[PDB]
């Protein structure tokens, strides 16, 4: 299959709560890049109490002899996604992602 798109895996640092200040304290981020195959599932409209929102989904596929690094969310084309399904059939990997919003 044709693999030309770029996918970046991001892992967040350790977190702990500071009761005096009342804020969460976090560490740094580690980013690793890779080139895989991605396809689009379409952007839908959903109606929520406060208004209307749009969310998209994408699928990432991988051939063997590739190891997936530990990660939390994935950045594909300036947007952050977070996985919902993870299937590993016969030494391959297939993932289904959905869009989320991450604090600046």
């Amino acid at each position: 299959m044709r693999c030309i798109d770029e996918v970046t895996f991001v892992k967040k640092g350790e977190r702990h709560y500071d009761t005096e200040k009342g804020e969460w304290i976090e560490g740094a981020k580690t980013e690793t890049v890779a080139t895989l195959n991605v396809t689009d599932l379409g952007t839908d409209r959903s109606l929520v109490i406060f208004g209307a929102i749009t969310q998209g989904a994408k699928v990432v596929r991988t051939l063997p002899l590739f190891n997936v690094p530990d990660f939390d969310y994935v950045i594909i084309d300036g947007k952050t996604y977070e996985h919902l399904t993870f299937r590993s059939p016969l030494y391959r990997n297939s993932m289904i992602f959905k869009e989320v919003t991450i604090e600046d």
């Binding site: 406060f50 208004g51 209307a52 749009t54 959905k98 919003t101 604090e103």
Partner: protein
Amino acid sequence: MIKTRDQSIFDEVFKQCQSLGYTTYDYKPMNEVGYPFVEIEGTTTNHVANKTDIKGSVELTLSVWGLQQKRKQVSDMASNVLYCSSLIQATDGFYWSLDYNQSTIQLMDDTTTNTPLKRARLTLTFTVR
């Protein structure tokens, strides 16, 4: 210049929220994407009569939406909105007064979207005195 009972307090609360520097919405459109916002839900009018004119109360409901890991910010916004609404004395043709015994603040988690959110719900009761 002189509006109904609902619209007067609606405009006053909207103006206070805008002046505080917060982003105020009514049915947030699709094209906007940022997350520390306010939105107004609805009003309700009750009447109490006497031998000169008609009085009563007006109830306004609004909520504050924010990200999951930011609770202090949402609580501070809710408290600031309540305090600034507590200073309203008179509008164009009416006299108001906030009823403290019937205003409440409730915090909870909302997971109606793909992102976990924090919501604070406000209830305000204004008396025509």
